[PDB]
């Protein structure tokens, strides 16, 4: 109530006169900013909106409502020198200009200004305006805090001070930091947005030493000794500087307290539900962020994917689309359909994590940072695949040009007993030209799809990494079914491993210590195109050896959280750029919190990041990995926003697919090779064919009356003629092979289910007795001895 | 008759470009450069629609678009991390515009900063690593050139050394950091200097592992 009194008093301090409508507008704006800001449920906010208007009608009769009560009620101080009511559009334009100049100054991260982040920026500025204005920001991780605070602190001119906490932090050092902050904010009249974080502060012990600053803005007993003399000298100097002549100790201390009340602002960032003190809840103003809406995610995905070519004028709208943004422009274009499916993917995964939490499984928190990583992976993947397609199309055009040049050479060579066989040679080449032109048409069809196809890889890179194989496939089928519902053209059968990795990289991975499973290869392509630093869930320990095999040339060093000298290893890796593998992340030190969030700070030429007390330099070749041997863990939602999760664990579906592939390799290798060629009907066979075409072009243009010396180069052109026909064969014979491998795998499936049940009984047997411990190597040795060394099989 | 109007409007714009490019890169303040470029941008925006069909206005407009695109590359090229070595690598990969470090803005501006973006990205990445390494070596020199052995009294007989644990923690921290330094990719240019410090660092350990011994037993022997 006294914050309400002070807010209305600060609204009517610089104004000259008002009507009743402006006063009740100011009063209701402060009611909305003091009561609706802490609410979580939307129904409570609607109740507050109804009852504010009911109170304003009840206690103020014969007052015009629509002049006083316009429901987009906003107030600002940037557009004019007064705190007049403003509209939304001019405020949005000004904050977009300020955010665009905020891009190029200190941090190059693109931001999106939807409807709610504007309101939150207005609220943070309104807290910054009031004396004794302290803010507590609550809500899910990411989603605005420690980025909106820095933004409005830069905009209103407040410098930012943070405490760098580590193991060595006593109350004396906290007193020294508070002395420096209060001396800077009081004597120098420097506005400081002292922001505190959940990482560096969870319970530092002396969090109640700043309760007096939160109450009235002075610590008694902080300035004992010579510090009172120093503060008295600088206090009289500052009071002389701003023209307030005071003499004695007490009036100068009162002026110092008043200047601390006016200047120093404190903003806490806290994650929701030990519990904080209710005094700390009462001392601040409590702003609830919440999760981003469908409109906010639509506005993020629209502004971030606008640069990519998404326009299909051929696109026929379907009759009914599953819509989740109700304010979509009906009927949509292709880009609108893509962004609607982009937010549909996030909605379906929120529903899927809720359904997995209904069953009682271990679910991890889902943040807007996951949506940002999904959109960034979509943009990078779309650019990469379109660049590859345009490059190979240009190389095909070069090949066509040289083919026409060689045809011109041959019809020159018909001037001149080799005149028959050379005329035989031309009878290949133009036919080859025809085959090449047919491939051109296919690449046009490749455009049709390359867009939604990238979508179904990109989410698969960023979203479904923690899940098992069956849940990943179910999410994939849900995304594919919605994309067929929205007339988005994409490949009906996609190999997720082959799309994101070439065969040479797979040969490198299998040449390293990596098993050849579908789950393990998908979690290997997880570790190639990550944005955030990854965490591995491996119960077998193979992932650590795979990681040190993949990065041994960069001299990766091994460490763990449980070492005493861990933080120096992380500091040296951050400073010198050598990559780091960090074990035992169940004892998660929160000092990694900026590093996974990539919180760099441009201080002059320096690139500073906070580690311990130190501010150290992020070398650009740094990359880190976090590891769990232990699969039974529940991480904080803070850690869900900062890392990408991969799952090397073994489940029923993973071992069932492993046993099915093993028995089909061991018993029906014709079906296994016909299935493996169906995986090779994607980019492997075509990359080998295009490499052969490029090598033929390396000896095609050597035609100057020289090619008729023996007329045997046609075989080099005929070695292409067979294999491409084989590529023409297996594409034509591609449905019968699908049905054949489906029927043969259907014949062998209950053996795989029996193998999975036997293995899970073997791993469940540990609870009977302490000696009943059997590994996965035991069961694979069982399966090898049954399948290969069986004396009854002969 | 409109050619006089459009050329009289564009002559001051071209002159403003001329006094912008003549500013020395030694004396460039790039935030003020952004402010002046935005002043030129809103002066461009102030022009009416009669001149929007001529080629000269849109040519100058896309020139200013290229300039405010490369404004961030300018504000990063003015960083303190870049030294004369990285300027020599910019000479090596950029070929043209032989600059004697008289450092005009126009000669830096006329080269295609938008086309050759990955080149200056690699140069700034290398300079970032070198600045990180050099400031680590500065921290080594500052910390170990001013370290003092704390001395405490002993029975009005002697003056012993107190605080072996923090000193040994510092020696172990610095020696392991030099060991990780030798694994760093940016290692060569500073290499022998680090080696000299490494030698000195090892010598310090080679004293103090002795010292506690000739402390401790002697105290015990006195007892």
Numbering used by the authors:
A (entry chain A): 2799 to 3071, 3079 to 3221, 3470 to 3847
B (entry chain A): 1327 to 1549
Sentences from the paper on this structure:
In our structure, the two dynein dimers adopt different conformations. On the other hand, the microtubule-bound dynein-B motor domains have a straight linker docked onto AAA5 and are in a post-powerstroke state (high microtubule affinity). In contrast, the dynein-B motors contain ADP and AMP-PNP in AAA1 and AAA3, respectively. The dynein-B motor domains are both in contact with the microtubule via their stalks, whereas the dynein-A motors are lifted away from the microtubule surface. However, 3D classification shows no evidence of any DDA complexes with LIS1 bound to dynein-B. In contrast our DDR structure, solved in the same AMP-PNP nucleotide condition but without LIS1, showed all motors in a post-powerstroke state bound to the microtubule. In our structure, dynein-B is in a post-powerstroke conformation and lacks LIS1 leading to the question of why it is different from dynein-A. Given reports that LIS1 encourages binding of a second dynein dimer it seems probable that dynein-B also engages LIS1 during DDA complex assembly. However, unlike the LIS1 molecules on dynein-A, which are additionally stabilized by the presence of p150, those on dynein-B are likely displaced by microtubule binding. This agrees with studies showing how LIS1’s interaction with dynein motors is incompatible with the microtubule-bound conformation and implies dynein-B is the first motor to contact the microtubule.
Cytoplasmic dynein is a microtubule motor vital for cellular organization and division. It functions as a ~4 MDa complex containing its cofactor dynactin and a cargo-specific coiled-coil adaptor. The formation of dynein-dynactin-adaptor (DDA) complexes is a key regulatory step in dynein activation. Here, we determine the cryo-electron microscopy structure of dynein-dynactin on microtubules with LIS1 and the lysosomal adaptor JIP3.
